[PDB]
Amino acid sequence: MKVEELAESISSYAVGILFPPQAEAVEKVFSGKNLLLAMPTAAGKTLLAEMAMVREAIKGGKSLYVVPLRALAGEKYESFKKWEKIGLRIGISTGDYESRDEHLGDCDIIVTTSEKADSLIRNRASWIKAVSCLVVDEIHLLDSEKRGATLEILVTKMRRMNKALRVIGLSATAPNVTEIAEWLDADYYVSDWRPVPLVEGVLCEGTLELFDGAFSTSRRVKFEELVEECVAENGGVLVFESTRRGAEKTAVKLSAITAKYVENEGLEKAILEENEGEMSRKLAECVRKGAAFHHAGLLNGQRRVVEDAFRRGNIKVVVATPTLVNLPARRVIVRSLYRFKRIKVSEYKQMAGRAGRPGMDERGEAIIIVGKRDREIAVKRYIFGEPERITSKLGVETHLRFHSLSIICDGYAKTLEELEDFFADTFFFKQNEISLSYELERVVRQLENWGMVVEAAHLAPTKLGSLVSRLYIDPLTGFIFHDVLSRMELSDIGALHLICRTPDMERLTVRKTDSWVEEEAFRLRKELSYYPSDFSVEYDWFLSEVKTALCLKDWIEEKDEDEICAKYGIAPGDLRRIVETAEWLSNAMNRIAEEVGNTSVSGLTERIKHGVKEELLELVRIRHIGRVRARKLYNAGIRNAEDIVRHREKVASLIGRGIAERVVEGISVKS
Residue type, 421: D
Domain residue extents for the chain = 3-195, 196-384, 396-613, 615-670
Same fold, 3-195 and 396-613: no
Whether residue 354 contacts residue 348, with contact meaning beta carbons closer than 8 Å, is answered with: no
Q: How far are the Cα atoms of 111, 125, 157, 190 from residue 144, in angstroms, in the given order?
A: 21, 27, 19, 21
> Is-contact 461 408, C-beta < 8 A?
yes
Residues in contact with 154: Cβ distance below 8 Å, sequence separation at least 6, in sequence order: 66, 114, 117, 118, 121, 136
- Alpha-carbon distance of 334 to 370, in angstroms, equals 9
Q: Where are the alpha helices (DSSP H) in 15-167?
A: 24-29, 42-59, 70-80, 114-122, 148-161
In total, the chain counts a number of residues equal to: 671
CATH number listed for the domain at residues 196-384: 3.40.50.300
CB 4 within 8 A of CB 26: yes
Which phi and psi angles does 135 have, rounded to 5°? -105, 120
Residue 536, φ and ψ in degrees, nearest 5: -90, 160
Enumerate the β-bridge partners of residue 369. 203
Residue 196, CB-side half-sphere exposure with 13 Å CA sphere: 22
b/e sequence 114-148, b meaning 16+ C-beta within 10 Å:
bbbbbbbbbbebebbeebbbbbbbbbbbbbbeebb
Rounded CA-CA distance 445/439 in Å is 10
Answer whether 148's CB lies under 8 Å from 129's CB.
no
DSSP sequence for 21-37: SSTHHHHHHTT-S-EEE
8 A C-beta contact, residue 508 and residue 544: yes
Q: Which residue type, as a one-letter code, is found at position 487?
A: R
Amino acid at 547: K
SS3 call for 416: helix
Amino acid in the structure at residue 571: A
Between the CA atoms of 591, 595, 598 and 599, what dihedral angle is there, to the nearest 10 degrees? 40
**CATH 3.20.20.210 is the classification of domain 396-613:** no
CB-based contacts of 295, cutoff 8 Å, min separation 6: 244, 247, 248, 320, 321, 323, 573
CATH class of 615-670: mainly alpha
What is the C-alpha to C-alpha distance for residues 483 and 51, in angstroms, rounded to an integer?
50
User: What is the resolution of the experimental data for this entry, in Å?
Assistant: 3.1
- Strand order, beta sheet including 90-92: 90-92, 109-113, 63-67, 133-136, 166-171, 35-38, 187-190
Give the contacts of 328 (CB within 8 A, at least 6 positions apart).
Answer: 236, 310, 311, 354, 357, 358, 360
Question: Degrees (nearest 5) of the Cα angle 270, 276, 282?
Answer: 80
Q: Report the distance separating Cα 659 and Cα 516, nearest Å.
A: 40
Count CB-CB contacts under 10 A for residue 577. Answer: 17
> What's 3-195's CATH class?
alpha beta
Report CA torsion sign: 411, 412, 416, 417: positive
Cβ pair 452, 402 in contact under 8 A? no
Phi, psi angles (nearest 5°) of residue 221: -150, 155
Amino acid identity of 219?
R
Question: Are the C-beta atoms of residues 616 and 631 closer than 8 Å to each other?
Answer: yes
Question: Residues of 556-573 as b/e, b for ≥16 C-beta within 10 angstroms?
Answer: bebbebbebbebbebbbb
